Amino acid sequence: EEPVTADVINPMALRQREELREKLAAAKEKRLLNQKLGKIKTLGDDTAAWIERSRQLQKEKDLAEKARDLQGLTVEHAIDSFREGETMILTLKDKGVLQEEEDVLVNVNLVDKERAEKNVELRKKKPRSILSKYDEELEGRPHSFRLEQGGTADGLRERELEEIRAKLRLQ
Amino acid sequence: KLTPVPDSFFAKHLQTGENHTSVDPRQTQFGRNTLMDMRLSQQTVVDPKGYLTDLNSMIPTHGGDINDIKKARLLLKSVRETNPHHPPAWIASARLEEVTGKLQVARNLIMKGTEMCPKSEDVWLEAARLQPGDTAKAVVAQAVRHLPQSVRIYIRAAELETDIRAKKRVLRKALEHVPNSVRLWKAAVE
Amino acid sequence: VFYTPKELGGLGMLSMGHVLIPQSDLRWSKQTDVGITHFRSGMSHEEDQLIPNLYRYIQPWESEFIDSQRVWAEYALKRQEAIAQNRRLTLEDLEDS
Amino acid sequence: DGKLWNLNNYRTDMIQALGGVEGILEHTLFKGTYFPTWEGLFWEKASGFEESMKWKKLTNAQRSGLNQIPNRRFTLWWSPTINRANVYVGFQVQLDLTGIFMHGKIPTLKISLIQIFRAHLWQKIHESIVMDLCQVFDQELDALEI
Amino acid sequence: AIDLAYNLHSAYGNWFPGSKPLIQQAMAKIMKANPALYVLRERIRKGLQLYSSEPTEPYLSSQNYGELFSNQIIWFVDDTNVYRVTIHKTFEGNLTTKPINGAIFIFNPRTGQLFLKIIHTSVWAGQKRLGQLAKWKTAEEVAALIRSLPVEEQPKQIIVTRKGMLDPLEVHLLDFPNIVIKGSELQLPFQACLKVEKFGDLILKATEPQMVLFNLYDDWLKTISSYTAFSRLILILRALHVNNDRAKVILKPDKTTITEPHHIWPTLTDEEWIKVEVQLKDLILADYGKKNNVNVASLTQSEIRDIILGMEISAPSQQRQQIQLTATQTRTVNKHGDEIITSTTSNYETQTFSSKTEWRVRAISAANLHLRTNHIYV
Amino acid sequence: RYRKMKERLGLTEIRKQANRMSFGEIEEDAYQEDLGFSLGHLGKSGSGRVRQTQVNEATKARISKTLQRTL
Amino acid sequence: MIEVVCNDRLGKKVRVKCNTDDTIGDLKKLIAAQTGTRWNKIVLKKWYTIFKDHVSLGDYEIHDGMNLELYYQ
RNA sequence: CCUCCGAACGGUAAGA
């Protein structure tokens, strides 16, 4: 057709541009620090009367001698998966340090239970959004919920009320 | 049989490089990390190990031992964001930026480390060696001002400032702070 | 295929000839949500592009000798400055040259 | 003496003359690899098999047939440009298990293309796309009035 | 039309209401996600020897698990239990939540010295980022402790259970280039060692974070080797990861079971150790079979080894192995386009669709239609 | 014997890393005497590891038995 | 104005300048001019694929320099 | 001003 405007992607020129930008920013920071490090005197008068000063200083010092932090944290487990009255320990999920992602809590035992259940389904599954079968491949989804204020997660009451409403509609 | 080349060949080829940060002014036209917590090593089964501190290894020994310089830079950036009161994290970041031959960035980073972690020693006397001349003198003056005035940075000031005309004043200002140091008395006496 | 650096997959050869790139080679296209969009570098009534000749990127011997003399003259003075200030050349004094 | 020549500007201007990464990589199978971006990728100058076979007491005829893998890989990388019918004017020939037309006997590329479309991959791609379109038309048959 | 060498797609022809956007979205999703297209792309990638940002580190797997038992000193740095919290859903109401003290594992398999570093909750006071601080704190303590031993006890290679620790350890050990920091394919059950009630009773009720030393080879080294003690420990820890309560009963075959406070494991003899190991192995296999619906007698030897050591790989439906005869008459053309009728037997365009509009599928859906007449929504 | 001979001829990490080459990141041509000689991810600050790789002791060059007895 | 080589391998190898907007009929007329066979008695193939007269040269992606196999009707 | 527009081959899968 009439091909549109295209910027040439040059990796070497890009690296040279970044190097120049970094050098200019470093020079700016150097001069700013020099402005800051100028207003402070660098004295870090005589000899014998200085010893007299020291004697006076010795006299002077002699006279002087005489659950809230867990708000907003995400748990990568279904709420129903927790049995009632059982204390479960949640560990922090492994994340790369060079990865900005919200911290997630996870219990290892629930994880291997979920993996076993998924494999059971996969063996059972012997072979709607548009082409929903590719949602796992495209977007990559464990059930999760977020802790509220005080670390308390109160969401099962809403689901119970929904179930009660559905049953009442059935009745 | 073929028996490929020893790994020492690749090691020496990649070692050729990482040249130097400075040159002795004698060659003519033709001629790092923390160590801030140790723990004493020594019935019942529980053993609280008393932990001590030597807080750095000041002298720069390691050099050019970094592969993936930008990955290491990102990692040390992450360290300094997550643990900004960690003096040797800043020390290692400054030494890494100094190793590559990026002196000014290392100087700025050690300035930010001194600003952010001032209650330490080795950060100040490594900023003194990274900063040149009068800037180093001002940095030592700041360290003397804030750090509670009973330290070795005073001998650093006396060493780097000037001749006896200013060395005497530096030693006087040192001895005026905690007048009990034998080294300061020995330096002032001669 | 010949003059693409080996990192990008080409042979990466150096040219002392006068090889021309036809305008049909500097055009491409990409697929997006709104169909296919066509790009090209040599867009307009331009002169035929030559791959760069190696000669322009080598400093001639005379210029290099004059620059060598000037550079080492500067280095001698910087070394004298380093001696007089009890410091060593910190790779920043010798950064311009 | 030191390295009395630097070739960074030469390579920079060469990539600029060739159109940059976008202008170069469309002569290649890069878009057929479907990598999201070219940033973090890397090459392998020798495969595991080709490296392991570099010293195994092979005959001269076996080694001669093993120093051709780099050429085959180079030819396959630049295949969308070497096999073009603009270059190599002449009759085109179709590989009898795929829709690939060979504009010239390029033996170091015919083999790399026979390997890629082994086990009737062309027919399986067509069948998979047909079945995926059938499914998407099936999920939309009340609104689509089918 | 699909361009496979350039991954392009287009469509020309007649359109009917609702067809153009439908095909646009369908083709956008198909080109991005397709088994056969993925196979083609992966095959091109392998042919070109072009890989994506994964230069593999040294990797401890189930195949090189034997080399783990050499004479050099190994460590097993673990930060799984650095940030630990407890919840329980009381059946009346909301979810209680209490953070507890964490632990850092520096277990050594050659001598059994389990180095523990406890973490008080106070360190997690005003930290917007928990994972990065956990990683960097654990690496800091690793390098702090690695400098306290002499050169003859420092590790020759360090193995980290969690892959996300690879980067921090390689930064905190820059001054120490000789120790090879290695990954781990197989999930070592080292988070289960806090399930021992001594460790829990210590950590849960501890403050002022301090280092402590243990020994998981209590008196075993007097009678058994080092990598027999390690294998026994691995079995016990896998069991405690599995149940932690059934294995608690198994760890006491009698009621005396003199587990003196001087050490951690019960003082038991080797002949009874064989039997209790057999019971423990049976427990692990029985739990694996219960969870995965497999037969314990059907497991092979290497299967049991992989079960005990780490974990096993699954197989999703998206993973396709696209890598009797029914003749079919089709109206085709020959090479010259002569409009012939052929009878083929190659099974390459025979996949029946049979979706939502077939007499068989419709009748199968109509089955059980009487059971769908319960909730009569008037 | 087989283990030792496999370890000697094995592809060490430093030699494994020189086999690779970054995509699109153009290296400077060190070693005038032979262009095309390039280390891989050894020092190119590409996608390698943070620390420098260590030389394998098994690849160290040694002399023969007859040569030693003549020495 | 692109240039297409229309080759018959026995021998009729001909070089024809044509426009991209040209349909295959116009290209066949030019080949008729340069070969002597009547334009409606000329078939342009791509190894088995017959180019149809009503389709422009741009649609077939017959670019400047491409060879087209010459057959007869 | 510049008008000299060339060609064929080196392009066969081997089988059933």
JSON list of N, CA and C in Angstrom, two decimals, chain C residues 34-75:
[
{"chain": "C", "resi": 34, "resn": "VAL", "atom": "N", "xyz": [-6.30, -5.00, 14.46]},
{"chain": "C", "resi": 34, "resn": "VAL", "atom": "CA", "xyz": [-7.09, -4.31, 13.45]},
{"chain": "C", "resi": 34, "resn": "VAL", "atom": "C", "xyz": [-6.64, -4.69, 12.05]},
{"chain": "C", "resi": 35, "resn": "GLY", "atom": "N", "xyz": [-5.99, -5.85, 11.92]},
{"chain": "C", "resi": 35, "resn": "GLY", "atom": "CA", "xyz": [-5.53, -6.29, 10.62]},
{"chain": "C", "resi": 35, "resn": "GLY", "atom": "C", "xyz": [-4.03, -6.19, 10.46]},
{"chain": "C", "resi": 36, "resn": "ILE", "atom": "N", "xyz": [-3.56, -6.07, 9.22]},
{"chain": "C", "resi": 36, "resn": "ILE", "atom": "CA", "xyz": [-2.14, -6.07, 8.91]},
{"chain": "C", "resi": 36, "resn": "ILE", "atom": "C", "xyz": [-1.72, -4.66, 8.53]},
{"chain": "C", "resi": 37, "resn": "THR", "atom": "N", "xyz": [-0.67, -4.17, 9.17]},
{"chain": "C", "resi": 37, "resn": "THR", "atom": "CA", "xyz": [-0.12, -2.86, 8.86]},
{"chain": "C", "resi": 37, "resn": "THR", "atom": "C", "xyz": [1.27, -3.00, 8.25]},
{"chain": "C", "resi": 38, "resn": "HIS", "atom": "N", "xyz": [1.52, -2.22, 7.21]},
{"chain": "C", "resi": 38, "resn": "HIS", "atom": "CA", "xyz": [2.73, -2.32, 6.41]},
{"chain": "C", "resi": 38, "resn": "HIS", "atom": "C", "xyz": [3.68, -1.19, 6.73]},
{"chain": "C", "resi": 39, "resn": "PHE", "atom": "N", "xyz": [4.95, -1.54, 6.91]},
{"chain": "C", "resi": 39, "resn": "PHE", "atom": "CA", "xyz": [6.00, -0.60, 7.25]},
{"chain": "C", "resi": 39, "resn": "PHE", "atom": "C", "xyz": [7.11, -0.68, 6.22]},
{"chain": "C", "resi": 40, "resn": "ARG", "atom": "N", "xyz": [7.91, 0.38, 6.15]},
{"chain": "C", "resi": 40, "resn": "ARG", "atom": "CA", "xyz": [9.10, 0.36, 5.32]},
{"chain": "C", "resi": 40, "resn": "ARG", "atom": "C", "xyz": [10.03, 1.49, 5.75]},
{"chain": "C", "resi": 41, "resn": "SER", "atom": "N", "xyz": [11.34, 1.27, 5.63]},
{"chain": "C", "resi": 41, "resn": "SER", "atom": "CA", "xyz": [12.30, 2.32, 5.98]},
{"chain": "C", "resi": 41, "resn": "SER", "atom": "C", "xyz": [12.44, 3.34, 4.85]},
{"chain": "C", "resi": 42, "resn": "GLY", "atom": "N", "xyz": [12.81, 2.88, 3.66]},
{"chain": "C", "resi": 42, "resn": "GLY", "atom": "CA", "xyz": [13.00, 3.75, 2.51]},
{"chain": "C", "resi": 42, "resn": "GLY", "atom": "C", "xyz": [11.68, 4.14, 1.88]},
{"chain": "C", "resi": 43, "resn": "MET", "atom": "N", "xyz": [10.99, 5.10, 2.49]},
{"chain": "C", "resi": 43, "resn": "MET", "atom": "CA", "xyz": [9.60, 5.39, 2.19]},
{"chain": "C", "resi": 43, "resn": "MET", "atom": "C", "xyz": [9.40, 6.20, 0.91]},
{"chain": "C", "resi": 44, "resn": "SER", "atom": "N", "xyz": [10.18, 7.25, 0.72]},
{"chain": "C", "resi": 44, "resn": "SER", "atom": "CA", "xyz": [9.87, 8.29, -0.25]},
{"chain": "C", "resi": 44, "resn": "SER", "atom": "C", "xyz": [10.87, 8.25, -1.40]},
{"chain": "C", "resi": 45, "resn": "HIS", "atom": "N", "xyz": [10.80, 9.27, -2.25]},
{"chain": "C", "resi": 45, "resn": "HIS", "atom": "CA", "xyz": [11.66, 9.37, -3.44]},
{"chain": "C", "resi": 45, "resn": "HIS", "atom": "C", "xyz": [13.08, 9.65, -2.96]},
{"chain": "C", "resi": 46, "resn": "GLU", "atom": "N", "xyz": [13.70, 8.61, -2.40]},
{"chain": "C", "resi": 46, "resn": "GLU", "atom": "CA", "xyz": [15.03, 8.68, -1.81]},
{"chain": "C", "resi": 46, "resn": "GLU", "atom": "C", "xyz": [16.07, 8.16, -2.79]},
{"chain": "C", "resi": 47, "resn": "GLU", "atom": "N", "xyz": [17.33, 8.42, -2.47]},
{"chain": "C", "resi": 47, "resn": "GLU", "atom": "CA", "xyz": [18.44, 7.81, -3.19]},
{"chain": "C", "resi": 47, "resn": "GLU", "atom": "C", "xyz": [18.58, 6.36, -2.78]},
{"chain": "C", "resi": 48, "resn": "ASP", "atom": "N", "xyz": [19.05, 5.53, -3.72]},
{"chain": "C", "resi": 48, "resn": "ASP", "atom": "CA", "xyz": [19.22, 4.11, -3.45]},
{"chain": "C", "resi": 48, "resn": "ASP", "atom": "C", "xyz": [20.22, 3.90, -2.32]},
{"chain": "C", "resi": 49, "resn": "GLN", "atom": "N", "xyz": [19.82, 3.09, -1.34]},
{"chain": "C", "resi": 49, "resn": "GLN", "atom": "CA", "xyz": [20.62, 2.93, -0.13]},
{"chain": "C", "resi": 49, "resn": "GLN", "atom": "C", "xyz": [21.80, 1.99, -0.38]},
{"chain": "C", "resi": 50, "resn": "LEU", "atom": "N", "xyz": [22.97, 2.41, 0.07]},
{"chain": "C", "resi": 50, "resn": "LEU", "atom": "CA", "xyz": [24.15, 1.56, 0.08]},
{"chain": "C", "resi": 50, "resn": "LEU", "atom": "C", "xyz": [24.38, 1.02, 1.47]},
{"chain": "C", "resi": 51, "resn": "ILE", "atom": "N", "xyz": [24.79, -0.24, 1.54]},
{"chain": "C", "resi": 51, "resn": "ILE", "atom": "CA", "xyz": [25.28, -0.77, 2.81]},
{"chain": "C", "resi": 51, "resn": "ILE", "atom": "C", "xyz": [26.57, -0.02, 3.11]},
{"chain": "C", "resi": 52, "resn": "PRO", "atom": "N", "xyz": [26.86, 0.30, 4.37]},
{"chain": "C", "resi": 52, "resn": "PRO", "atom": "CA", "xyz": [28.00, 1.17, 4.66]},
{"chain": "C", "resi": 52, "resn": "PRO", "atom": "C", "xyz": [29.32, 0.56, 4.20]},
{"chain": "C", "resi": 53, "resn": "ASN", "atom": "N", "xyz": [30.17, 1.42, 3.66]},
{"chain": "C", "resi": 53, "resn": "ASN", "atom": "CA", "xyz": [31.51, 1.02, 3.25]},
{"chain": "C", "resi": 53, "resn": "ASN", "atom": "C", "xyz": [32.45, 1.07, 4.44]},
{"chain": "C", "resi": 54, "resn": "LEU", "atom": "N", "xyz": [33.34, 0.08, 4.52]},
{"chain": "C", "resi": 54, "resn": "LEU", "atom": "CA", "xyz": [34.19, -0.07, 5.69]},
{"chain": "C", "resi": 54, "resn": "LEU", "atom": "C", "xyz": [35.20, 1.07, 5.83]},
{"chain": "C", "resi": 55, "resn": "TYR", "atom": "N", "xyz": [35.59, 1.71, 4.72]},
{"chain": "C", "resi": 55, "resn": "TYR", "atom": "CA", "xyz": [36.68, 2.68, 4.75]},
{"chain": "C", "resi": 55, "resn": "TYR", "atom": "C", "xyz": [36.39, 3.86, 5.67]},
{"chain": "C", "resi": 56, "resn": "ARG", "atom": "N", "xyz": [35.18, 4.41, 5.61]},
{"chain": "C", "resi": 56, "resn": "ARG", "atom": "CA", "xyz": [34.87, 5.61, 6.38]},
{"chain": "C", "resi": 56, "resn": "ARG", "atom": "C", "xyz": [35.01, 5.40, 7.88]},
{"chain": "C", "resi": 57, "resn": "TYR", "atom": "N", "xyz": [35.01, 4.16, 8.34]},
{"chain": "C", "resi": 57, "resn": "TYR", "atom": "CA", "xyz": [35.02, 3.84, 9.75]},
{"chain": "C", "resi": 57, "resn": "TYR", "atom": "C", "xyz": [36.40, 3.46, 10.27]},
{"chain": "C", "resi": 58, "resn": "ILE", "atom": "N", "xyz": [37.45, 3.69, 9.49]},
{"chain": "C", "resi": 58, "resn": "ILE", "atom": "CA", "xyz": [38.82, 3.55, 9.95]},
{"chain": "C", "resi": 58, "resn": "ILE", "atom": "C", "xyz": [39.47, 4.92, 9.92]},
{"chain": "C", "resi": 59, "resn": "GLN", "atom": "N", "xyz": [40.04, 5.33, 11.03]},
{"chain": "C", "resi": 59, "resn": "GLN", "atom": "CA", "xyz": [40.72, 6.61, 11.08]},
{"chain": "C", "resi": 59, "resn": "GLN", "atom": "C", "xyz": [42.02, 6.53, 10.28]},
{"chain": "C", "resi": 60, "resn": "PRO", "atom": "N", "xyz": [42.28, 7.48, 9.38]},
{"chain": "C", "resi": 60, "resn": "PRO", "atom": "CA", "xyz": [43.48, 7.40, 8.55]},
{"chain": "C", "resi": 60, "resn": "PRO", "atom": "C", "xyz": [44.75, 7.52, 9.39]},
{"chain": "C", "resi": 61, "resn": "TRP", "atom": "N", "xyz": [45.85, 7.02, 8.82]},
{"chain": "C", "resi": 61, "resn": "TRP", "atom": "CA", "xyz": [47.10, 6.93, 9.57]},
{"chain": "C", "resi": 61, "resn": "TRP", "atom": "C", "xyz": [47.61, 8.30, 10.00]},
{"chain": "C", "resi": 62, "resn": "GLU", "atom": "N", "xyz": [47.55, 9.30, 9.11]},
{"chain": "C", "resi": 62, "resn": "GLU", "atom": "CA", "xyz": [48.06, 10.62, 9.46]},
{"chain": "C", "resi": 62, "resn": "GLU", "atom": "C", "xyz": [47.26, 11.23, 10.60]},
{"chain": "C", "resi": 63, "resn": "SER", "atom": "N", "xyz": [45.93, 11.19, 10.49]},
{"chain": "C", "resi": 63, "resn": "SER", "atom": "CA", "xyz": [45.09, 11.69, 11.56]},
{"chain": "C", "resi": 63, "resn": "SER", "atom": "C", "xyz": [45.32, 10.93, 12.85]},
{"chain": "C", "resi": 64, "resn": "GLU", "atom": "N", "xyz": [45.52, 9.62, 12.76]},
{"chain": "C", "resi": 64, "resn": "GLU", "atom": "CA", "xyz": [45.77, 8.81, 13.94]},
{"chain": "C", "resi": 64, "resn": "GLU", "atom": "C", "xyz": [47.10, 9.15, 14.60]},
{"chain": "C", "resi": 65, "resn": "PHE", "atom": "N", "xyz": [48.15, 9.42, 13.81]},
{"chain": "C", "resi": 65, "resn": "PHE", "atom": "CA", "xyz": [49.43, 9.80, 14.39]},
{"chain": "C", "resi": 65, "resn": "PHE", "atom": "C", "xyz": [49.36, 11.16, 15.07]},
{"chain": "C", "resi": 66, "resn": "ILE", "atom": "N", "xyz": [48.71, 12.13, 14.43]},
{"chain": "C", "resi": 66, "resn": "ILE", "atom": "CA", "xyz": [48.57, 13.44, 15.05]},
{"chain": "C", "resi": 66, "resn": "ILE", "atom": "C", "xyz": [47.76, 13.34, 16.34]},
{"chain": "C", "resi": 67, "resn": "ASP", "atom": "N", "xyz": [46.65, 12.59, 16.30]},
{"chain": "C", "resi": 67, "resn": "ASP", "atom": "CA", "xyz": [45.86, 12.37, 17.51]},
{"chain": "C", "resi": 67, "resn": "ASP", "atom": "C", "xyz": [46.66, 11.63, 18.57]},
{"chain": "C", "resi": 68, "resn": "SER", "atom": "N", "xyz": [47.52, 10.70, 18.17]},
{"chain": "C", "resi": 68, "resn": "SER", "atom": "CA", "xyz": [48.35, 9.98, 19.14]},
{"chain": "C", "resi": 68, "resn": "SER", "atom": "C", "xyz": [49.29, 10.92, 19.85]},
{"chain": "C", "resi": 69, "resn": "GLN", "atom": "N", "xyz": [49.98, 11.77, 19.09]},
{"chain": "C", "resi": 69, "resn": "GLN", "atom": "CA", "xyz": [50.89, 12.73, 19.71]},
{"chain": "C", "resi": 69, "resn": "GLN", "atom": "C", "xyz": [50.14, 13.65, 20.66]},
{"chain": "C", "resi": 70, "resn": "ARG", "atom": "N", "xyz": [48.99, 14.17, 20.23]},
{"chain": "C", "resi": 70, "resn": "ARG", "atom": "CA", "xyz": [48.23, 15.07, 21.09]},
{"chain": "C", "resi": 70, "resn": "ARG", "atom": "C", "xyz": [47.72, 14.37, 22.35]},
{"chain": "C", "resi": 71, "resn": "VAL", "atom": "N", "xyz": [47.24, 13.13, 22.19]},
{"chain": "C", "resi": 71, "resn": "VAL", "atom": "CA", "xyz": [46.68, 12.38, 23.31]},
{"chain": "C", "resi": 71, "resn": "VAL", "atom": "C", "xyz": [47.76, 12.08, 24.34]},
{"chain": "C", "resi": 72, "resn": "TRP", "atom": "N", "xyz": [48.94, 11.66, 23.90]},
{"chain": "C", "resi": 72, "resn": "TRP", "atom": "CA", "xyz": [49.98, 11.35, 24.86]},
{"chain": "C", "resi": 72, "resn": "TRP", "atom": "C", "xyz": [50.61, 12.61, 25.46]},
{"chain": "C", "resi": 73, "resn": "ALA", "atom": "N", "xyz": [50.60, 13.72, 24.72]},
{"chain": "C", "resi": 73, "resn": "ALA", "atom": "CA", "xyz": [50.98, 14.99, 25.32]},
{"chain": "C", "resi": 73, "resn": "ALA", "atom": "C", "xyz": [50.03, 15.35, 26.46]},
{"chain": "C", "resi": 74, "resn": "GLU", "atom": "N", "xyz": [48.73, 15.17, 26.25]},
{"chain": "C", "resi": 74, "resn": "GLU", "atom": "CA", "xyz": [47.77, 15.41, 27.33]},
{"chain": "C", "resi": 74, "resn": "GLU", "atom": "C", "xyz": [47.98, 14.44, 28.49]},
{"chain": "C", "resi": 75, "resn": "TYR", "atom": "N", "xyz": [48.28, 13.18, 28.18]},
{"chain": "C", "resi": 75, "resn": "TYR", "atom": "CA", "xyz": [48.47, 12.19, 29.24]},
{"chain": "C", "resi": 75, "resn": "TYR", "atom": "C", "xyz": [49.68, 12.52, 30.10]}
]
